Amino acid sequence: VEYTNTFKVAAVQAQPVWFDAAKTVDKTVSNIAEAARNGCELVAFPEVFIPGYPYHIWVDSPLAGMAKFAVRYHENSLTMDSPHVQRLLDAARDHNIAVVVGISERDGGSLYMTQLIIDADGQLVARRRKLKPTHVERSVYGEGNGSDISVYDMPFARLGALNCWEHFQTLTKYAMYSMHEQVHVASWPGMSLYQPEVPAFGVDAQLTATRMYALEGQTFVVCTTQVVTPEAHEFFCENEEQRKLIGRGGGFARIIGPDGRDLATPLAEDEEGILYADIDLSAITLAKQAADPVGHYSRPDVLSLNFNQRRTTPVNT
Amino acid sequence: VEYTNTFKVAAVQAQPVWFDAAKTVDKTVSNIAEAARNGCELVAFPEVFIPGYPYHIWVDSPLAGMAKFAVRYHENSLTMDSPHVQRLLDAARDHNIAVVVGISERDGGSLYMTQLIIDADGQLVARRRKLKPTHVERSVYGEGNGSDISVYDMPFARLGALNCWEHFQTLTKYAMYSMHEQVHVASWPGMSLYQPEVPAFGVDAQLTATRMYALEGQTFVVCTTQVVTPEAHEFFCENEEQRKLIGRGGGFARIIGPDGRDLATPLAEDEEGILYADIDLSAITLAKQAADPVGHYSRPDVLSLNFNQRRTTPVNT
Amino acid sequence: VEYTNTFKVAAVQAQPVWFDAAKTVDKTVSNIAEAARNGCELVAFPEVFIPGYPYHIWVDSPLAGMAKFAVRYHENSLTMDSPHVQRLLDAARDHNIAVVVGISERDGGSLYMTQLIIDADGQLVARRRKLKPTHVERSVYGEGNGSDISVYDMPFARLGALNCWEHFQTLTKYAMYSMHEQVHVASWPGMSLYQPEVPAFGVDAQLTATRMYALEGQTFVVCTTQVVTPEAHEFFCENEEQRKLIGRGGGFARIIGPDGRDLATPLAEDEEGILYADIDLSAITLAKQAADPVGHYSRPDVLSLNFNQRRTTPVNT
Amino acid sequence: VEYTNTFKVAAVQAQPVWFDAAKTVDKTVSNIAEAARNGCELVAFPEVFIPGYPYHIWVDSPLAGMAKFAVRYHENSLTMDSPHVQRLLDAARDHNIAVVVGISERDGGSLYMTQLIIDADGQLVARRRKLKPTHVERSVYGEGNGSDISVYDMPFARLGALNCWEHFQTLTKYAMYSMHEQVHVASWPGMSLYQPEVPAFGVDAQLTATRMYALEGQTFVVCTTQVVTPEAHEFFCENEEQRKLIGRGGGFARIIGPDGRDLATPLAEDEEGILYADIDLSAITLAKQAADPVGHYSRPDVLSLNFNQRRTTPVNT
Amino acid sequence: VEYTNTFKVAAVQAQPVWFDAAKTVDKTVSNIAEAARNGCELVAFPEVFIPGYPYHIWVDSPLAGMAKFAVRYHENSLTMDSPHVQRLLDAARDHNIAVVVGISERDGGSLYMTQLIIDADGQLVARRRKLKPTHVERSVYGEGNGSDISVYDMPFARLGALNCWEHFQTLTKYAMYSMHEQVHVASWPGMSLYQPEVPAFGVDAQLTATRMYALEGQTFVVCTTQVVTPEAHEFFCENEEQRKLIGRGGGFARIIGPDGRDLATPLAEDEEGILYADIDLSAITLAKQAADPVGHYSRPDVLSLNFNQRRTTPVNT
Amino acid sequence: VEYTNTFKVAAVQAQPVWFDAAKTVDKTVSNIAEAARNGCELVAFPEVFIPGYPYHIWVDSPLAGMAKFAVRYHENSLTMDSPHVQRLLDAARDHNIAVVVGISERDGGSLYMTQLIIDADGQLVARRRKLKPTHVERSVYGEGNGSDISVYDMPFARLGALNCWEHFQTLTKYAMYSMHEQVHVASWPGMSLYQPEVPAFGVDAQLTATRMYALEGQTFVVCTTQVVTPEAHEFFCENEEQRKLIGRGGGFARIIGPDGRDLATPLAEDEEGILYADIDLSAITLAKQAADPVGHYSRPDVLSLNFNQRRTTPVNT
Ligand SMILES: *C(=O)c1ccccc1
Ligand SMILES: *C(=O)c1ccccc1
Ligand SMILES: *C(=O)c1ccccc1
Ligand SMILES: *C(=O)c1ccccc1
Ligand SMILES: *C(=O)c1ccccc1
C-alpha cells in the first residue's frame, strides 16, 4: 500500500544446538538481543532453527534415521503452547524487535516446518506452515494449507516468509506477489547436501532462487540459513561416507534489494554471524517501473491464479 | 501433547457374579487392589462387568429373556448415585490406581452400556455411554451422544475408552484419533457367541479390531474381556442347544503397542487373570513416523470429519 | 445395490521383473491368461507391479537411490497411452477377465502409484492414483485427489481398489463404505522391510489391516502382494546390512470374506503363485446383519464425513 | 513425454546488421550453416535479431527515436510472407537444423516481437509473439495471445521459447511447465542499458532469471543474446551521454541444464560467436526427483492456473 | 502490406450536369484527362456524380420529387453494362489513371449509390454500393451489402472508398482499418442542406468526419465533393424557401494525411476544380507509431468485430 | 432511455500542482465549489489531474524520467482508499454536484489512469480505468478491462467517460454508443507535445476526435483538458530542447452538442478556467433523426460488435 518507510533488518547465519530446543532457544534469544542492540526492526532466523534441520534423513536410510534420531527430533519439537515459544515471544517484546524464526512445530504426533512471525509487541502474528516439504523431507513433516500462504501488515512493512524450496513453487510466488510484499524472509537450511553430485542443492542454486524472488516480485528478501559446521558432523555423520553427504558450511545468508543486488556483504559459507542492511521501501517503486507481475505487467485475460485460502482441518466439528 | 511418560497398566480378563451387583463389585475391588499391589496405575475391566453382559438376549427368544432375566438384570444395574459406584471410587482412591470399569448404568427405566473413568484421586473423571449398541443389544440398552466420545487427560496419559464393536466404527475411531489419545481401554464381553456359524463374533475377529485400532491410531490398547465359563452356562443355558449358542471361553484380554505387537503374554480363552505391561509413550513417536491419520496422512482438502460433541437430553429445561 | 451374484476371483502373489516394464507386462499377461483359464472373472495384481516397487528408497540414502535407480525407474514407468497399457487392455479383452493391475503411472516428469481397473471388455474403467504415499514413498511418487476414491459398478460386482497403507486411513475407508463397495482389491508390495525392528511393516500388521477392512465394510478383500525373492536381493541391495533391511519373502496375498475368514489357502511368504476363490455376495448380507458403518449402525447426527470428489488440476483452462 | 533422446544444440551470441533485414538474414543463414556443420539439431538466435533490437527507444526521447529510427525500423521488419522469412525456412531445410530466430514481425502497420520456430524440414512450426513487451518497448510493439504461450513437440524434444522478460512473468513460466517443456530457448537483447543506475537490466539479473527458469522447470535453457558492439554506438548514439546509457557488450548467451549448471563455457560480454553443448534429456529425470512444479511438487487444491489459449483477433468474420 | 510507395492523387470538387448522364460523363472524362496531364495516379469524383445527387428529396415533399424528378433521375442512372460506364473505363485506360467515380447505378428498377473503382488498365476493379443511404435517400436508393465493404490492392496503394455519412459508421470504418487502407476516397455531395438549422449537415461537420477517418486509421483521405452552383438552384428550387433549403457551395474537397493535416490548399465552398497532392506512404508508418486501432492499440480480448462479407442476393439459383 | 431532462454542466481547463496530490486535491475542491455556485449539475476535470500528467516520459529518455520523477509520481498517486479520494467524495456531497475527476490510481505498485465518477450524493459511482494507455504511457500505466467501459445512469442523464485517445478507439466508441450515452466526459492532458513535428498531438487533431465523438454518437461531450503553463516548464524542462518538446498551452476544454456545435465559448490554449453550458437532452432526439449508429442506421447482419465486459483479475480466488 505505502512504499515510504525506511528501517533496518538483520539476517542470521547460525547453527542450532542440534536437537536441543532449550539450548537453541537460548541461542536464538541472544541473537535476537544482538540484532536489537543494532537498532534492527526485524530479525530473521533459519528454517527449522530451534531443534535444527533433520539432516539424518539425507545421510542414511530411513531406518537408521528413525532408530537414532526420530524420537529425539520429535521430542525436541515445540508445541505452540510450549514455554519455549513464550520465551521467543517475551524476547521479542523485551527487545522491541520483530522476529521471524523457523521452528519445527509439533501438533499431536506430526511435525510441521512452521515459521513464527512475532511482532515487536510480543504478539504472534502468524505460525504459517510449509505448504509442501521437499523430497524425503516429506517423511518427517506434514503439509500446510492455503491459509499458510499470507502476507502480514507489520508496522514497518508488509511481511511475507517462505521456507526453503517454496521459492521454486511458481504459483506460491505469485500468491505472495498478489498480496504486495515488500519484505520477504527466506529461511533455508545449510544447503551443503550432495554437493558434487546434485548441483540443485548447491548454495549457487538457492542463491538464484532467492535473488529471483526479489527480482521477480520486486521485494526485499532477507535470506537466513543454517550452517553445517564440524559440530554437525559429530552429530549426524557416523563414517567418512556420511561426512561427504553433508559437506561443510552451506550458509548463504543475504539481504537482497528489489533489483536483486545484495545490500549486505555476505559472510563465508562456513562462518556464522548476523548481517545487517537498511531497507528503503522507495527502492521498490523504482523497481516496479520496469516489471510488476501482478500489476501493469500482467494479462489476466490470458493467465490467472486460483488461490484457495480456506483453513482445512481434519475435524471440522 | 507429550509422549515421554512411562508407566504400568493392567488388563483384567475375569467373569462377574452374574447379575449380582454387590457380589461383582467386591470382585472388582479385589481385582483393583490386586493390580495396585503390582505397581500398576491403570486397571481396566471388561464391558458391562458389574452386572455382567446380558447373554440371555442371544441364547433365547426375546420373551424368554424378558420373562426370566429382564427384571433381575435391570434391578442389578448401577445408578450413578448408588453406593456401588462410591465403592469403586473409594477403591480407586484407597489404592491410588486409575480404574476404567464398564458398568450397566441405570437411568430411570433405561439402561446404558456405561464406562466409568476413575482417577487415582478417586474422582469420577468421566461416565461415557456406548454410542450405538450391537444389533440385538439395542433392545436392552439406550444410545449415547457425541459427548460420550472423548479423550481424558489423565496424569499418566491421555486416556480413551470404547466398548465392544465401537472399534468397527470408522468415524468414531477417527474422532478418538483426532483427540490425540495414547492409551486406549477396549472393553469386550466373552466373544464366544454363535461361534461355529458367525465368524465375525470369534475372538479372532475382535483381535484384529483391537490390533488395528493400535496400528491405525498409534495407540496403546488395553483390551479387557469377560469369560464365558461353566458358571455362565448354569445361569443362561437351559438346554444343550443354548449351551452351543453361548459357546465357552471367549476371553482375549491383550495389551497392544502402537505397532500392533502384544506387550503381555495372552491368557487362555477360558482362563482368568490380570495382564501387566510397561507402557513407554516414546514408543508412539516411533510409530507416528510411519502413520498418522489425523496428522501427515490427513488430506482435509479431500476428507474431513464433522464431529458434533454436544450432549443432547430429552428435556432441556 | 444387489447382493445376489456369484463369481470366481484370483489374487496374484507375483514378483515382477525388477524395473522392466516390457518384461513385467509379459509376466502380467501370462498371469492374466492363467487366471482366465481357471474361470476367474477378476484377477488382481500387486501394488506398482509393472515396474516393481522401488525398494531402493528404503535400503540406502536418497542419494544412493537417485544416482542408481531413479532414472531407470522413471524410464520404466508406464505412461497411460503407452503400448504397455494397451497390451494389458488387449489381454483383458482377449481373455474376457477384469484386471486390476497396479502400475507406476508416469505423467510428465512425475510418477503416481496408479491402479488400472480394466473390465472384461478391454476398456479402462478407472485410473485411480494413491491418495497419499507413505513415508519416503512420498519422495518418489505424487499424490492423487478425491476423484481417485471411488467404487466402480463392474458387471459382476461393485468394485473398489485401494493400495498399500491406504487401508490405514479411516476416512478413506469410510468414503469407500459409503459408496457400497462389495469387492475390494488391496494391492500391496512385498512387506518385508525392517522386519526385526519395525513390526508395523511386518506382514502380520498388514494382514490385520486387510482383514479389518473386510470386517468393517463387510466386503470381499482380494489382497495381492509382491514377493521379495533372491532376484530382488541381487537387484537392490549390495551389502549384508542392506540385505537385512530388504527382508526376504513378504508376500501375503489372500482372499478374505466379509466375516474376515480367508476363502483361499494362503501361500508361503516366499512362495509365488495365484490364489482362487468363489465369491457369493449373499455372504455380505449376513455380515451386514450385525454391522453396517454407513447404514443402520451409524450416527450421522454425531459423526459425518465431508467427501470432496472434485478433480483438481494444476491448470484448469 | 519421453526423457531419453540426446542431441546437440547451439546458442548464438551475435551482432545484427542494425535495421537492415537483408544483411541480417544473410548473417543468420551463415550462423545457421556454421551450427549445422558442428552437428547441432537446434540453433537459436537473439530476440528481434533480424532487424535488431530498437535501442533508440531507451537512449533518447520518443520524438528523437520516432523522427530518426521508427520508419527505418518499421520498413526493415519482416512480414510473414516476406522473401526473408522464406530464406530462413530454406536455410533450415538445406542444413537440416531446427532454427529458433527472433524477428520483429510486421502485421499491417504494427510490429511484434515474434519468435519463428522452424523445424529441420523447413516448415514454420510456430510464429509466437511476445505476450507483453517491456516498459518503453510497448510503444513500438504489440501484444500476443495465450495461443503464443505454447510448447512444440519437435522431433528431438518438446521445445518452447520465450524472449526477454517473459521469464519474469511467473504465471507464464508455470503455463510452460504445465505443457512439459524440456528444451527452452531464451532470446534476449544486449542487456547493457543503464548499467550504473538500473542493476535490474544487467546481465547478472538476467542470468538469475534464465538459470531460475531451468531450476524451476527442470529444462534445458538455450539462452541467446545480442551484443552492443561499437558498431551499435555509431548507429544509435549521437553523443557521450547516449553512449553511457547504451553500454558496451551485454551478451550473455549460455546453455544450462536442468540442474542450473552451465553446459558450455560462456563467452565474454563483448565477445561474439556461437557456443555448443550436448543435451541428454535423462538429466531432467534426475532434476524431477527433487522438484516438479506441475507434478508431485504441486498443491492444485490450493493454487491452480487459469490458462486461456484462445486465439483472439480484432476481426472474427 | 508495404508502406514505401510515393505517388500523386487528384481530388475533384466538381458540379454535375444535373440529371444528364451523357453530358456528366463527358465532364468526368475531361476531369480525368486534366488530372492525368498533371501526372496523378488516382483521380476521385464526388458521390452519385454522373447523374448528380438527388437534392429534390430534401427540398420538397416526396410527391413533389416523385412527380417531377423521380422518372428523370431514374432514366439517367447508369447500368453496369451501359455505354457510359464503358466510356469511363476507356478514359481510365487511355490516360493510364485510376478513377474512383460515384454513380447512381441502376439494377432493374432500383438505384444504388455505387462507387466504381477503375484501375489504370481500364478494368473495373470494383463496384461497391453504399451500405445504407443516410436519412431520406433510403426512399430513392437501396441498401448495399457486406461485400461492398472492401479494400482493393491497386498498383499504387491499397485503396478503399466510402460514400458520404458512411464515414459516421463506427463499425464500417473499423472493417476498413482491419483491411489496411492507406488511401481512402471519401465521396460527398454538396453539403449545404438546411445549413442554418441542421448544423450536422454543414461542411464543418463533414470535415471532422473525414479528418477523423484519417486520424483513426492513419490513411490518406482523398475527399471529393459536389457544389450547389446557381445552376442547381435553377434545377431543383422553384420558391425562395427551397433555395434556402439547399444553400450555396457545399464543396469541401481536400487531401488529408494520416496526421490529419491537409496536403492541398482547399478551394472555396463555391469554387470548382481539382486538388493535387503527393502521397508518401512512409508518412503512415510514422503516424502508426502512436495509434493503430487494429494492431498494437487494440484489445481483441475485450472488443472485436463480427464482419460478414458474404454476397447476399434475392435469388440464389 | 429518456431524452427530456435539462441541466447545466461545467468543463474545467485547469492546471494541477504538479505531482502534489494534497495541493491538487485542494485545487480540485475549489473548482468543484466554484462550479456548484453556478448551478452546474456536473463538473469534469482533466486526465490524471490529481497528481498531474507525467510529461517526463515524453521530454527525456526513460532513465531520466525514472531517476527523477518515477518515485515522485508514484508516491503522489491516489489509492482508492486514501483520504484524498474521500475529500473528493465529501466535496461532491457538500456542494451536491456530480464530479468526474481523472486521477492516477495506485493499486499496489502499479498506476492506472482512472476516471472517478462521483454522484451528487457523495458516492463513488465508478472508477473506470483506461483500457490501454497511449505510446510511452504504457511504460508508466497499466491496462483496464471491459468492465471499465460502461455508461452510468446518473440522475440527470446517462453519463460516460473516456480518457485521452480512447476517442480514437473505433470499437470503444461503439461500445459506448450501444449503452446509450447522452453526456460524455472526455478528459485530456495538455496536448502541446511535439507540436512542430507531430500534428496528431496538436489540439487541432484532438478537437476533431471529441467533436466527431459527439457527431458520431449524438451525445453531449464535456471536454476537459490540462494546460502546459510556465509552471510546468519549471517542473519538467531542464533546458531549451526539452522546453520546446512540451510547448506552452495545449488546453482545449469544450462543450459540444450532438450536432458538433460548441455550446460554450472556448478559452485560450494558455488560459485557465471553467466554462459552463446548458444541456437539453431533446437536442439529441433531433440529432438521432439523421444518424443513429447503434439503431436505425446500423446493419447488424453485416457488422456487429463482440463486447467482453467481464471483470478480469490476476487472482480469481
Ligand atoms: C529444502 O528445504 C531443501 C532442503 C534440503 C535439500 C533440498 C531442499
Ligand atoms: C459387542 O458387544 C458384540 C456382542 C455380541 C456379538 C457381537 C458384538
Ligand atoms: C506401503 O506401500 C508401504 C511400504 C513400505 C512400508 C510401509 C508401507
Ligand atoms: C527486454 O527486452 C528488456 C529490455 C530492456 C530492459 C529490460 C528488459
Ligand atoms: C449523405 O450522403 C448525406 C447527404 C445529405 C445529407 C446528409 C448526409
Ligand SMILES: *C(=O)c1ccccc1
Ligand atoms: C493521450 O493521452 C495522449 C497523450 C500524449 C500524446 C498523445 C496522446
